[PDB]
């Protein structure tokens, strides 16, 4: 198996792979979310409108459970991986606690997934 340390430190104290993943986010479309009183509104940029494009498959706003959805910015393939991982974890949490997730729970899961791919070998 491939086990090189991809994400390492630098003499200035920096994890360059993490900063470059942040650069990969900053080339993605602008996802904007505003939390209101009884509604939360997500809105993303299309930026490649391209009237031959069927607009359903390139929706950057995805639902994670009955009460949690998400929008992303960056690499849509990484995004789709993290979205499927989070949908699986929402179902596992409904299974094991007989309650839906909080947004804090699935946010903590997604963030721990991203952090574990900042520190594991070969990732």
């Amino acid at each position: 198996s491939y086990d090189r340390a991809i994400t390492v430190f630098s003499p200035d104290g920096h994890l360059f792979q993490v900063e470059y993943a942040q650069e990969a986010v900053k080339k993605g479309s602008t996802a904007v979310g505003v939390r209101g009183r009884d509604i939360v509104v997500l809105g993303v940029e299309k930026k490649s409108v391209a009237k031959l494009q069927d607009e359903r498959t390139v929706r950057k706003i995805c639902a994670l459970d009955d009460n949690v959805c998400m929008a992303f910015a960056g690499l849509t393939a990484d995004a789709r991986i993290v979205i499927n991982r989070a949908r699986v974890e929402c179902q596992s949490h409904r299974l094991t606690v007989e309650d839906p997730v909080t947004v804090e729970y699935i946010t903590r899961y997604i963030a721990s997934l991203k952090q574990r791919y900042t520190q594991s070998n070969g990732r």
């Binding site: 639902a63 459970d65 499927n84 949908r87 699986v88 596992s92 409904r94 299974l95």
Partner: protein
């Protein structure tokens, strides 16, 4: 023994199940639900070995709900039946088998209503009516006697009540109440619990 029954009309599926959880001499729970909502138009009714029923059916339920989350559309009741049959048949020869008897009720928008029998070996059988438990031996002949494929749901509830009156008359276990649901194009509906 625990009793399930489904009745499949022209545009509906009528299912009932006994509402009893027992521990071998005592009825520990007399308001116990054996029906499991897979999706908005699919019920999975499960009886069998203790523990295997809830574990297997909540596995099936989370994978069907996960299909809907991944895909934006639900499984058809045919696909849900074959998925359930496939997981039960794969676990049949594993280290941890599931000894569960299953009625998968469902309404598809194109296929219409659909009922599926499934024994513990995972043989899948689409049926116009089906039942499990030892009360099936008493009630399936009444269903053979009185069912026509064009049955209205009011006559279906009367036929269901004939089966449950037979269970009160002739069957040896006390099964006083029966959770009765119906699935149609408007979803799953709790009907009145047939009580005795």
């Amino acid at each position: 023994m625990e009793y399930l029954i489904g009745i499949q009309g022209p545009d509906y599926v009528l299912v009932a199940s006994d509402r009893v959880a027992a521990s071998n001499i005592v009825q520990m729970k007399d308001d116990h639900d054996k029906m499991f909502k897979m999706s908005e138009k699919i019920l999975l009714l499960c009886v069998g070995e203790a523990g295997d029923t809830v574990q297997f059916a909540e596995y099936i339920q989370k994978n069907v709900q996960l299909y809907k989350m991944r895909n934006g559309y639900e499984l058809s009741p045919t696909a849900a039946a074959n998925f359930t049959r496939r997981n039960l048949a794969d676990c049949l020869r594993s280290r941890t088998p599931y000894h569960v008897n299953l009625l998968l009720a469902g309404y598809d928008e194109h296929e219409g209503p659909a009922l599926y029998y499934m024994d513990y070996l995972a043989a899948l059988a689409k049926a116009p009516f089906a039942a499990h438990g030892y009360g099936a031996f008493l009630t399936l002949s009444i269903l053979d006697r009185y069912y026509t494929p064009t049955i209205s749901r009011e006559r279906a509830v009367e036929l269901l009540r004939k089966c449950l009156e037979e269970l009160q008359k002739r069957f040896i276990l006390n099964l006083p109440t029966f959770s009765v649901r119906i699935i149609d194009k408007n979803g799953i509906h709790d009907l009145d619990n047939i009580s005795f």
